[PDB]
Amino acid sequence: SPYGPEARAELSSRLTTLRNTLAPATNDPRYLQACGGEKLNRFRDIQCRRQTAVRADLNANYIQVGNTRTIACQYPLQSQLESHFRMLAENRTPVLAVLASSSEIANQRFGMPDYFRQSGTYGSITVESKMTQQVGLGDGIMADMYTLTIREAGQKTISVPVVHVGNFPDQTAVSSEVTKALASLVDQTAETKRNMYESKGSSAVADDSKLRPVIHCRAGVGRTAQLIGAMCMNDSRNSQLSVEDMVSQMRVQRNGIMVQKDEQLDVLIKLAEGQGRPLLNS
Numbered sequence: 379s380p381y382g383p384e385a386r387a388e389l390s391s392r393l394t395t396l397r398n399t400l401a402p403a404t405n406d407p408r409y410l411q412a413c414g415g416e417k418l419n420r421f422r423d424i425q426c427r428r429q430t431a432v433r434a435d436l437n438a439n440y441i442q443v444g445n446t447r448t449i450a451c452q453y454p455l456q457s458q459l460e461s462h463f464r465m466l467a468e469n470r471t472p473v474l475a476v477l478a479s480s481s482e483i484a485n486q487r488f489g490m491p492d493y494f495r496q497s498g499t500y501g502s503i504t505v506e507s508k509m510t511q512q513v514g515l516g517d518g519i520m521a522d523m524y525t526l527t528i529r530e531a532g533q534k535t536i537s538v539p540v541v542h543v544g545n546f547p548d549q550t551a552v553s554s555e556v557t558k559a560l561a562s563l564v565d566q567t568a569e570t571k572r573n574m575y576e577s578k579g580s581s582a583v584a585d586d587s588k589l590r591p592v593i594h595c596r597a598g599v600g601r602t603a604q605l606i607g608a609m610c611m612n613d614s615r616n617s618q619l620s621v622e623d624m625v626s627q628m629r630v631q632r633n634g635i636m637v638q639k640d641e642q643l644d645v646l647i648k649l650a651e652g653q654g655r656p657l658l659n660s
Contacts (some may be wrong), residue, residue, distance in 0.1 A: 380656065389647075390640075390656050391607065393622070393629075406425070408427060410428045411428075418436075418437060420468060420596070420597060425437070427632050432465055436451060437452040438450070438598075439631055440587065440590070442627060444608040444616035447521030450606060450632050451598050451602075453598070454493065456489060460500040463500060464503065467503075467538075470582040471592050472575075472590075473591045474540045475541045475543075475593045475597035476595075477543050477546050477594065481545075494542065495524065502530050503528070516554075517555075517556055518545070519560075520540050520545055521543055522544045523540060523541055525538065539571055543560065546595070550614075564591060564609060565591075565612055593606060597635075599633065604645055607649070609646075620657060621647060621655070621658075622658050
């Protein structure tokens, strides 16, 4: 009954209502609007909540699901790379999880710059990419890891661990088992990096806006939301946080499309069921 079809339908009903409420109006005061004439949103209908926006020129949001703090964003546009790197550096990013596949990135029609597997200079910022380990996630899904060293005059140099799911499907959802494996890897990688900063007495530890895992796929609403849901379920502080809570929180803090597909929600529901976590709020 708590995970039966009627509970699942009720969850869907509540979430659909929320999506409708959060649909952007023309020049919606709730959503970030482009300044300067440059394209801001990769997709016109996938907008960035203004009050939680990380930077004025990025489609990117601070999200807190229960106690779990992250940043969710779109795959940055070519024009946005300098700002994106500055975000990554200023956040002292403990892990960047990229859920867009190599196939997607390679499709030049999609405008997804290969910004983390190659080195480059973007305005004032110089970035060096290095290959690190590779970790299997199940079902032949592979996480390729990198470190990005971000250098800029006047700024401290920051190295960001990257977890790239190079063969993450976009046509089908990955299983709860793959999702769990990915959440554990991303969490573990963030933990190691955050520990390093703690050991150096970094001032970023005291700052709520910093040390956030950064997660993006192509749009930052499907695969991204599925991962963030799994990560929040991995957080021992989040007992009794329901699936309704986690999805509504993602939606209010980014846009109404978070967890876009029923296929993705099914994964979150299965993970919740495995923990005996509630789907709905009383």
